Design a protein around this ligand. Structure first.
Ligand SMILES: C[C@H](C(=O)O)[C@@H](NC(=O)c1ncnc2[nH]ccc12)c1ccc(Br)cc1
Length: 163
């Protein structure tokens, strides 16, 4: 594990992360997809072999020796608020289990179920809180990657508020 496990946020492409493994905001079918998923596909295409997995789960596939953890968050256009919230929390718990199993000292992670899976709602606080609930008991350094400029400031404030 990391010597002093921490949380950090960076506004940049997760495909260019400086961590020991990456979490993909995957679709359930293991398709190249769009946004984060497409960037992950362009960088580690070999990791998409048999990467299909149900909503609320995570499946790791190695690209060489670099682990890609395909985490499938719910699309809130399809799920109710209650059922979607439960699947989103579950997807993050499965990511924590995989990060622990892999023995990595750091992990790059995006905010699951935001953007096109958000059902047109701002889900920064909801997704980030579920990320903390799952990762708080792990000892990996967590680096959150985002694209929205207002989101970088909000995530940074949320991390600092807890320290
Ligand atoms: C809404 C969120 C953000 O702005 O942080 C967005 N992130 C991104 O697209 C994004 N964030 C980090 N590295 C990236 N590389 C290429 C894209 C990209 C995102 C949308 C939908 C889902 Br599901 C998950 C994440």
């Amino acid at each position: 594990g990391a010597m002093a496990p921490s949380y950090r946020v960076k506004r940049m492409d997760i495909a260019k992360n400086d961590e020991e493994c990456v979490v993909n905001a995957a679709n359930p079918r293991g398709l190249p997809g769009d946004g984060v998923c497409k960037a992950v596909y362009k960088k580690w295409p070999e990791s998409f072999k048999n990467s299909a997995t149900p909503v609320g789960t995570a499946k790791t596939v190695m690209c060489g020796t670099y682990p890609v953890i395909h985490a499938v968050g719910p699309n809130f256009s399809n799920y109710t608020e209650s059922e979607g919230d439960r699947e989103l929390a579950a997807a993050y718990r499965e990511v924590a289990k995989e990060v622990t199993r892999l023995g990595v000292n750091s992990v790059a992670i995006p905010l699951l179920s935001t953007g096109v899976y958000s059902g047109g709602k701002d889900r920064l606080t909801q997704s980030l809180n579920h990320l903390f609930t799952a990762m708080d008991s792990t000892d990996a350094d967590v680096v959150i990657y985002c694209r929205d400029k207002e989101w970088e400031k909000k995530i940074s404030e949320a991390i600092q508020m807890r320290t």
